[PDB]
Amino acid sequence: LTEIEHLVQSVCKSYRETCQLRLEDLLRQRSNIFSREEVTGYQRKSMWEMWERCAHHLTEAIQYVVEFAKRLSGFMELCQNDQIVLLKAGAMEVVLVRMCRAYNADNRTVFFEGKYGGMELFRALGCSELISSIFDFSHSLSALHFSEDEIALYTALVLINAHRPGLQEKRKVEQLQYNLELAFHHHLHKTHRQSILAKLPPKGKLRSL
Amino acid sequence: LTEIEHLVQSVCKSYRETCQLRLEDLLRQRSNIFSREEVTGYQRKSMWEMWERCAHHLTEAIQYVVEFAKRLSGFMELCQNDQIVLLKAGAMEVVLVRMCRAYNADNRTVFFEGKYGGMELFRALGCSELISSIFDFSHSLSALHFSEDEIALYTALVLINAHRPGLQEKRKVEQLQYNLELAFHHHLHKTHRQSILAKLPPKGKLRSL
Numbered sequence A, B: 001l002t003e004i005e006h007l008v009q010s011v012c013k014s015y016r017e018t019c020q021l022r023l024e025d026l027l028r029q030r031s032n033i034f035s036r037e038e039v040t041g042y043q044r045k046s047m048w049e050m051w052e053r054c055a056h057h058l059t060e061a062i063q064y065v066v067e068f069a070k071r072l073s074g075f076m077e078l079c080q081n082d083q084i085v086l087l088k089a090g091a092m093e094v095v096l097v098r099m100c101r102a103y104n105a106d107n108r109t110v111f112f113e114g115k116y117g118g119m120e121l122f123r124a125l126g127c128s129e130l131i132s133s134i135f136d137f138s139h140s141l142s143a144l145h146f147s148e149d150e151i152a153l154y155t156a157l158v159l160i161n162a163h164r165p166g167l168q169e170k171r172k173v174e175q176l177q178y179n180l181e182l183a184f185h186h187h188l189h190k191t192h193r194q195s196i197l198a199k200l201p202p203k204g205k206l207r208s209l
């Protein structure tokens, strides 16, 4: 048990050190909503200006997820190729999961570049259905009321997936995965939160949306 | 006249050396249309996989545009800051103009990753309005039947624009711009193609769409 409970600890600690934006900081800024003047400024930008801003933010978020993977006990031991495949396959899946921390379901806003704004903040993109899916996915995830410890373990499971294609040493990913799934269960039962397992999004929904 | 005509030559030669994809190779591949199986494969990908694909292709195209600017006589002489502002302001405008070369208006398809596909190739993006704009813009530009020499001069004009905000040494951009506009006119007149000037897209349309 001290084995599993130490895995839960190092996973959470690794998440703490790589969460990029602390939860308490995002909640303290909730009342800081973008004004209409500021929304129009975003809407007046060009399609390339908004596409490039979001690409930058996502690329920077992936780096933090790379560090999260680096500090998962056992991930560094996996072969180089398996490290690339797992990251390229699930890094952005973890970023989108992390994005729900920046989402406020009370008013349906998201933290972005200093303040909270709705979907209309991203109109210049021309990706209203994509953005709608991101808001909708975050809204459905917010209804789980994830703790930071639950996001730490859940995101680690999203990353360490033995089924990804291209994995050469599957069985050594299977081991690192089962330990994480069991750690997930131990922490959930010790906090009376096992009822959210049947509510998590399917492995497939994380992507196509 | 040998002064203007040599500017037309070095601009076209610079375009030739930086066109990335040669026109003859794009035309030779027009009959190579994506099959339905291959279209579904693109439509089954994840939102992040397609966004990541397109982002990579666009970034790589910008690099070629950077080289096109480097070889425009006088551009290197401009100050460092003015080089950054001009490129950041018009590099993607030149990429989108160049994209019409990969567009076939006979069947409304575009070359992408080895074959020609319609707008339904990008459905997984969730950016139907944006993509619709790239197709519509390319279709309107295809009706001009640009020669490669005309794209060389026109794109150089799109890049060298004295009106861009942030330009410190405007008058030295004005000089390099006037020479290019006059070169544009000389080549169009000597080829009886001056009638396309009244048909070019406005300076603003190149962006927001």
Ligand SMILES: COc1nc2ccc([C@@](O)(c3ccc(C(F)(F)F)nc3)c3cncn3C)cc2c(Cl)c1Cc1ccc(-n2cccn2)cc1
Pocket: A020, A021, A053, A054, A055, A057, A058, A061, A095, A096, A098, A099, A102, A110, A111, A112, A113, A114, A115, A122, A131, A134, A135, B047, B048, B049, B051
């Ligand atoms: C709703 O649309 C978005 N919402 C976002 C909300 C937060 C952040 C975030 O990166 C951030 C960090 C720091 C600051 C700063 F600087 F202000 F503090 N601002 C923002 C952040 C904070 N915690 C985690 N993340 C990731 C970025 C967002 C982005 Cl990029 C978009 C656009 C977008 C999203 C997804 C795809 N996509 C394409 C394919 C799949 N998905 C495309 C575009």
Ligand SMILES: COc1nc2ccc([C@@](O)(c3ccc(C(F)(F)F)nc3)c3cncn3C)cc2c(Cl)c1Cc1ccc(-n2cccn2)cc1
Pocket: A047, A048, A051, B021, B053, B054, B055, B057, B058, B061, B095, B098, B099, B102, B110, B111, B112, B113, B114, B115, B122, B131, B134, B135
């Ligand atoms: C219609 O949608 C697209 N059509 C494209 C057609 C061609 C290419 C191209 O880069 C290329 C090169 C090599 C190969 C390969 F691999 F086959 F050789 N394939 C393709 C290319 C060839 N000549 C010039 N270019 C640029 C890329 C395309 C892209 Cl990215 C899109 C998506 C898209 C378009 C625009 C924005 N955007 C965001 C803000 C504003 N605009 C976003 C996404």
